[PDB]
From TrEMBL, chain A:
Signal peptide: none annotated. Coiled coil: none annotated. It comes from the Viruses. The chain holds residues 1228 to 1325 of 1374 of the full protein. This is Major capsid protein.
UniProtKB/TrEMBL annotation, chain D:
Keywords: Capsid protein, Host nucleus, Virion. It comes from the Viruses. This is Capsid triplex subunit 2. HAMAP family: HSV_TRX2. Disulfide bonds join 1-82. Pfam families: Herpes_V23. GO terms for cellular component: viral capsid. The gene is UL18. One of its GO terms (molecular function) is structural molecule activity.
UniProtKB/TrEMBL annotation, chain E:
This is Capsid triplex subunit 1. It comes from Human herpesvirus 2. Pfam families: Herpes_VP19C. The gene is UL38. Disulfide bonds join 126-253. GO terms for cellular component: viral capsid. One of its GO terms (biological process) is viral capsid assembly.
């Protein structure tokens, strides 16, 4: 809702307007609802950031949210030569503050 | 056009905008774990094969 | 979708005797829980 | 081994019980998969349909239905036969008694046949209790499929008698040497109908669009009839194909179907499997551990599951 | 005493013998641990377990129970290549591409393939398709509330698209087993299930772990077409049949089980009858496979409780003996 | 398992002994199940029949007549192979070696003749004792049948020629058929005799029904039911083949016998009945080419 | 004639005695005419010629 301001930086709305906006180019490229990528095995670092469906689905209570950070499941694997997207079977339990 | 941007970027013209690179790096760390006197229960069963 | 079932632990010691001998399947519509095992079955154990 | 016991009914005879002693290794057809059974369910009196004994094409249809069981052992009050259609799971190889002029070899799939040879005989009678036992003749599937073809065609020659009264043999075979003369006796409408019905039916489904692409090749075959010694042999002297030559038609539906491949598959299913649908397919194949590589006629053939 | 020498087993052994003839607690456990191995070892092929890892997208072990049919779903990746050929040209072979994609869209390759379609999930997908409803839809209510109506609808669109283009649901989906124990994590599942052998003899117990029982319950009073309308006592047999609609109903998918004593060479005949669906006239419908013997006629049971009230038919004792697919016509 | 122990001959070269060591997990066809067998009896020089080394058809005959046994342990001065046909079904898991496509967690591998793929590749010659071993390729039944029909299909076009059959993506993999070069000339020359028995049995089948149907139903329920469901199918095919072809109950019936036999002899050769299944556990579930795969005796 | 067979033999006075047991022919004694040995047939004539 770029009519409003940016919580992190309140004096401005977006830094990159070509990304932070819905149906913006960046959104189209990295958001998972669109999934251009999905055919390919390689991880997308940005798939974590653009994905309201994923960003929203979580809960808000920091009580938990800090303990599930200590043991997050990484979106990647350390077992490939190029860093892939974490496949379906198996867990990682990374830490992952981001 | 994406064909134009090919001829530019390869040949070293700045095509009027710029990117922000994102990459996800993974580290093997070393941890310390404190724990209290009884933090768990941990019941034990009976073996079999 | 089913009643909690029959107690095999209780009935190991019965509190009484049924004095008749009949085929209970005919009276099937009279009971809350009816199971019929022919010569033994797994759930009993 | 899920053996099925068969209770000699009673009655019986000093001489009749000695006849059953030598029936071990022979085959029985039981009309169920059972544990308790009566002796009379196996007898040829059970093969009798309403009022009538099936002919020798009727039996094949009766042996189509029910289950072949090879007798393993015979006890005073029961007969033990393990139903090959199911209980074939033995570590080693149940004994089949070769009853036939023929000889098994090693690896020959064995399909059964009603008794069909002139010197064949094979009916057994037990006077104490009215019943009999015809034991099927085991036989290599190459030979058992040649026979069924003979019985089918002979019953079909007869449906419509036109041409004079002297027809070809079709009643006589050869396996190795040894002329084998089939029994020509009766043909029954219903028994020949179904055998004709399923023959006609399946040879139709084996014809497809891509088949016409193959019929183009008949003139090409006869070009090979004559310049190779094989391909010369392939074409039997009495070959309709030879008389059939005495073409693409465009009509290709978009060009990406591959009708050749599809025509093979279609033919292979329906027409390829005709011995099996006309007769009962092999469920056993001779195997001999001792390394004896044939089975003499009258001997016991060690037999293992399906080819 | 006489009833246990036979039950605890010596006599057969004796005949064999004659022929030849003419930290303290841990210590206790080690001694006992050893005894168990020796006894198991001294004792001693009626069982086979297949094990596989898949996702929970399709299938799903937890929703299902102790006795269940799991079917394999071979070549997901393949199918589009297959659709182009073996399909007459006027079949719009691009239908599957999207449909499998559509099925997948509803819900990549990664490291856990989605194999293992459950029997359940087919009954619901074709529930509205085959001609019965709400005994069939009761199964559909089971899956939407446990296993998504999207995936059911996407997968139904795939079944329609497959039966459309001459790539059938069979020549896909072979039998896998009886579902012994799943062991799932997150979106992952490791499914143990019986390759072949008898079911009732596996993890056993009341239930193998604490929920309930074991059975090979057909799951439909809608499935469990019980042949032998006219029958004699005999070992019953279990087959798997797919019935299809080729424009009579627009590529109908019927999936159910037949239980009667006929050896496959006799099932093709009885499958020719009992179907007025033969008026396709390209060619082909009704494939069948034998799940395995039920070497006792009697356990077919009439019940309706599972998971929702479902018609559930219980089959007492089964010896899965799978076999191959035969449909030529 | 009933192991049968094949006896390696007298002194073999050290590079040959290492050739055999690499043959564990390969399928052998053993002529008889005798516990003691020679190596020459197994070697491909023992498939000679008519004075020649057998073609792909002559092989497929033999593969249906002898017993395949997987090699379990190769020992100097023995080979221990456990026949696939013997014992109870679903037991005696013995490891195979995958060759070509994956062999997923099931599917009943068929052992089809080697020439269907790189011909001499897999000949595995032993020069010291002057013999050779051609191991069949373990392919799944749906794919094995698709291939063997795919090649005889390509074989006929070649018979007289003036859409590529040879791509054949199997599952994820697109399995290349053609090795180009003259391998096709070597592949096509060995399928030469299988193609003909196929061409013959078709052309001889149609012309025999196309003559019989009009020379039957003209002599009851036969007539009505026949022409009933054959509408625009059998009869249409009759007019069309009789259009581009020529037209005797007595030769008819005696040729219907000889065809009916030859036909089912090809259905036996063909259809590559599965020897084994794959049932894994605590295993990958897909056996990558060249990797030992679990396997059990009946489909 | 052939010599593949003759070639397929050995000439080893070392070996010449042990394949003697092996027979350079393929028939069986239960046929009517001596035939070509069927596949089921296995053999150990002494085959001098």
């Amino acid at each position: 809702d770029h009519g409003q301001s940016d919580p992190a930086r309140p004096f401005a709305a977006t830094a990159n307007p070509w990304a932070s906006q819905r149906f913006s180019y960046g959104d189209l490229l990295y958001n998972g609802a669109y999934h251009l990528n999905g055919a390919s095995p390689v991880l997308s670092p940005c798939f974590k950031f653009f994905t309201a469906a994923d960003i929203t689905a979580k809960h808000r209570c920091l009580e938990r949210l800090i303990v599930e950070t200590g043991s997050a499941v990484s979106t990647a694997t350390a077992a490939s030569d190029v860093q892939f997207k974490r496949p379906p079977g198996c867990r990682e339990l990374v830490e992952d503050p981001c | 056009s994406p064909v134009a941007l090919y001829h530019q970027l390869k040949t070293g013209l700045h095509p009027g905008f710029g990117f922000t690179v994102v990459r996800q790096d993974r580290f093997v760390t070393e941890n310390v774990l404190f724990s209290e006197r009884a933090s768990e229960a941990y019941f034990l069963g009976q073996l079999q094969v | 979708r089913d009643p909690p079932g029959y107690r095999y632990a209780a009935a190991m010691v019965p509190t009484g005797s049924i004095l008749s001998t009949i085929e209970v399947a005919s009276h099937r519509r009279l009971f809350d829980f009816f199971a019929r095992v022919r010569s033994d079955e797994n759930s009993l154990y | 081994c899920f053996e099925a016991d068969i209770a000699i009914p009673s009655g019986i005879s000093r001489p009749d019980a000695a006849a059953l002693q030598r029936c071990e290794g022979r085959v029985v057809f039981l009309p169920t998969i059972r544990r308790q059974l009566a002796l009379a369910d196996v007898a040829h009196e059970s093969f009798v349909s309403g009022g009538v004994s099936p002919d020798t094409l009727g039996l094949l249809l009766a042996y189509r239905r029910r289950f072949p069981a090879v007798i393993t052992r015979v006890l005073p009050t029961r007969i033990v036969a393990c139903p090959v259609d199911l209980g074939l799971t033995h570590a080693g190889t149940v004994n089949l008694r070769n009853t036939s002029p023929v000889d098994l070899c090693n690896g020959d799939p064995v399909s059964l046949v009603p008794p069909v040879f002139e010197g064949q005989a094979t009916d057994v009678r037990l006077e104490s209790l009215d019943l009999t036992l015809r034991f099927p003749v085991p036989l290599p599937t190459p030979l058992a499929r040649e026979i069924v073809a003979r019985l089918v065609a002979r019953g079909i020659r007869d449906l419509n008698p036109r041409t004079p009264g002297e027809l070809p043999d079709l009643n006589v075979l050869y396996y190795n040497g040894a002329r084998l003369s089939l029994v020509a006796d009766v043909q029954q409408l219903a028994s020949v109908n179904t055998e004709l019905r399923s023959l006609v039916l399946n040879m139709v489904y084996s014809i497809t669009e891509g088949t016409t692409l193959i019929l183009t090749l008949i003139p090409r075959l006869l070009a090979l009839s004559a310049q190779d010694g094989y391909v010369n042999a392939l074409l039997q002297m009495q070959s309709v194909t030879r008389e059939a030559a005495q073409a693409p038609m465009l009509m290709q539906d978009g060009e990406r179907r591959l009708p050749l491949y599809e025509a093979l598959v279609a033919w292979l299913a329906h027409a390829g499997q005709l011995g099996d649908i006309l007769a009962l397919a092999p469920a056993v194949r001779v195997c001999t551990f001792d390394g004896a590589a044939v089975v003499q006629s009258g001997d016991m053939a060690p037999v293992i599951r399906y080819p | 005493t006489a009833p246990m020498a036979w039950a605890e087993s010596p006599r057969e052994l004796a005949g064999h013998a004659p022929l030849r003839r003419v930290t303290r607690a841990t210590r206790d456990d080690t001694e006992q641990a050893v005894d168990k191995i020796l006894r198991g070892a001294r004792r001693a092929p009626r069982y086979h377990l297949t094990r596989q890892v898949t996702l929970t997208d399709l299938c799903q072990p937890n929703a299902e129970r102790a006795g269940a049919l799991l079917l394999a779903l071979r070549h997901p990746t393949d199918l589009p290549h297959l659709a182009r050929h073996r399909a007459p040209p006027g079949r719009q072979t691009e239908r599957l591409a999207e449909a499998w994609g559509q099925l997948l869209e509803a819900s990549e390759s990664g490291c856990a393939r989605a194999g293992l379609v459950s029997f359940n999930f087919l009954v619901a997908a074709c529930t509205a398709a085959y001609d019965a409803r709400d005994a069939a839809e009761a199964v559909r209510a089971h899956i939407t509330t446990n296993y998504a109506g999207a995936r059911l609808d996407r997968f139904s669109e795939c079944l329609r698209a497959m039966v459309h283009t001459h790539v059938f649901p069979h020549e896909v989906m072979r039998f896998f087993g009886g579902l012994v124990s799943w062991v799932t994590q997150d979106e992952l599942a490791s499914v143990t299930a019986v390759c072949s052998g008898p079911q009732e003899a596996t993890h056993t117990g009341h239930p193998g772990r604490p929920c309930s029982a074991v059975t090979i319950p057909a799951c439909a009073f809608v499935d469990l077409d019980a042949e032998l309308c006219l029958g004699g006592p005999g070992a019953a047999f279990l087959y798997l049949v797919f019935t299809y609609r080729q424009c009579r109903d627009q590529e109908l998918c019927c999936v159910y089980v037949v239980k009667s004593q006929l050896p496959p060479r006799g099932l093709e005949a009885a499958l020719e009858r009992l179907f007025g669906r033969l008026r396709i006239t390209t060619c082909t419908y009704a494939a069948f496979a034998e799940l395995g013997v039920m070497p006792d006629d009697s356990p077919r049971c009439l019940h309706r409780t599972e998971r929702v009230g479902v018609p559930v038919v219980i089959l007492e004792g089964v010896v899965w003996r799978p076999g191959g697919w035969r449909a030529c016509a």
